[PDB]
Design a protein around this ligand. Sequence first.
Ligand SMILES: *C(=O)/C(=C/N[C@@H](C(=O)OCc1ccc(F)cc1F)C(C)(C)S(=O)O)NC(=O)COc1ccccc1
Ligand SMILES: *C(=O)/C(=C/N[C@@H](C(=O)OCc1ccc(F)cc1F)C(C)(C)S(=O)O)NC(=O)COc1ccccc1
Lengths: 305, 305
Amino acid sequence: SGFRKMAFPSGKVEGCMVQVTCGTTTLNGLWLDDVVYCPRHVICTSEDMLNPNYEDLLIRKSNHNFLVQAGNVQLRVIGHSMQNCVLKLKVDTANPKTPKYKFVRIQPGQTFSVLACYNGSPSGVYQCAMRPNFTIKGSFLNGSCGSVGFNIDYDCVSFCYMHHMELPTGVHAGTDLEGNFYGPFVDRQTAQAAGTDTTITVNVLAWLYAAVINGDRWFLNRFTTTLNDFNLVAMKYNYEPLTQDHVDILGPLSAQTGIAVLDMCASLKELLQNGMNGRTILGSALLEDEFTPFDVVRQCSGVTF
Amino acid sequence: SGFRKMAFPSGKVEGCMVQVTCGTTTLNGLWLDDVVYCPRHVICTSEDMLNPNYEDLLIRKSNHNFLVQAGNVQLRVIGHSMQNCVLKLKVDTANPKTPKYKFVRIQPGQTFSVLACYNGSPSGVYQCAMRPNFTIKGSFLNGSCGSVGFNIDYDCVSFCYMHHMELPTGVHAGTDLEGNFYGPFVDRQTAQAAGTDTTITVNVLAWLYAAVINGDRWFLNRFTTTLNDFNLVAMKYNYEPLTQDHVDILGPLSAQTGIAVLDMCASLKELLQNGMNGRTILGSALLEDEFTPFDVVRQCSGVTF
Ligand SMILES: *C(=O)/C(=C/N[C@@H](C(=O)OCc1ccc(F)cc1F)C(C)(C)S(=O)O)NC(=O)COc1ccccc1
Ligand SMILES: *C(=O)/C(=C/N[C@@H](C(=O)OCc1ccc(F)cc1F)C(C)(C)S(=O)O)NC(=O)COc1ccccc1
């Protein structure tokens, strides 16, 4: 028993992290086969970032201007190209530690592990969620850009995120590994506002199921509701609307616990209207939304890699 | 910026996890050089666990009764011995992935990463703390026994924990890698009560410093206190007494932020007496105590491995 915010094992990703330097800007790259992926803003100065013309900046860069170092060992850059907001540095050596991998663009509400790095060296790993407004709430200091987010399925690493920037509100924005930003963000030092950060309802319900499975059931009330009635309350409280697709995804947890999804919705409705009254659920005084139904099933069943 | 519960990168430990089976009991082992370490209760049946005589049970086991599998590949056991509550299975093959490693016995209040495994395969990694009552609050299902806790210093893995058992209260007990239990626990299916779980005061203060560094300062009050006055309040609230050694350990965070340790103690005193009043600190509605001062400095400075 017990329920923890749990990251995927990071080994397969550790073996892919390199340092990329373009005169005095250093950040992280991802080395897969004979390509190193990194944020294109590695090529920007101080002043460049206010309104960079990446096309024009990149024309003044040669292969030999991109310093790529894997531990103590320098990689030879034999080509470079720009795909959306990432650079692909083609190196003369295939990463011998390349795992089975996919590039996947994730949906808001989905969770992934981040391997926070500095100077191409891993510092730590943590599990987070793509917020509905396409930000993440990470832990990223200067030099963490190029750190990646990922999921593992058995032996295959699905890379879903590369870190590009901290907004002035201290939340984080980045791209998929095709260099397309999540949400409306652009890789420029400019006024960029996140949309409203709604709570991921389906994840809160998953976590309430995790709570019941792990023995914390005080919030189970004598009530039920309908999707429409529940969603009236969700809307009031800045929760994402719950769909029949979400109900279907919660089916296996509903089956395991014997608690109908709409009964759990009625429990969540009361928690939103009444608060916790100084009580906790799985050691938290707030409704957690960074566990997917798949995370709860995975953790509660003991799936491995 | 941003502040996350962050685990060490798990790669170095992933390469050491094996499956150990002793007729129909399967759990995890740690393969370092030519030795596999695992909980000695691998040799127990159902009924054995009520009052096992490990000396006597082990005499009926031969090398060939210990099935050790590293991924798909069987390891040849050429010796076995019992050290306290762990078995050392001497195998004919040195683990080629053995990292630089120490065995360290940690102090209550210190944090470490757990690589949760099943059948010798890593499932996930999470950061936790040795509680003052020598339990940990982990995420451990049937088959997770032999999962290890560790810290990394640059390239050296300090193994501090091996998982042995869940108490009937759903908290977790285990040993150092010399097989000595943390706290009073024994590897038997018996009435075992944890002592009082006090809050790790020095860690809460570290986390309040992390909060200030990351911009959440609403709890900074106009007051100071003394160690003795603060400790009167600590005792009331089941906080560990704060010592001058703790104050000294907080020095670098006190220096970074310009907030005197005893001023932060006065902030903590008011939070304990008044509660949060529906406010949050670093996105939490409770006072977090599973970050050490060293964790806060490490995360806030970007130390790598
Ligand atoms: C990626 O690595 C990166 C981080 N940026 C830092 C930054 O520049 O500040 C660092 C800093 C450290 C210590 C100080 F005392 C003062 C500092 F400013 C921040 C995230 C702002 S900081 O850790 O809060 N880059 C970005 O976030 C975005 O960078 C760009 C670069 C070019 C174009 C657009 C965005
Ligand atoms: C270590 O791997 C281990 C876990 N024990 C389990 C257990 O036995 O129950 C598993 C279980 C799974 C699914 C069910 F429907 C019912 C079950 F009981 C628990 C931790 C109790 S469970 O995950 O809560 N072993 C131990 O924790 C301690 O084992 C021993 C063995 C011998 C001597 C002493 C202790």
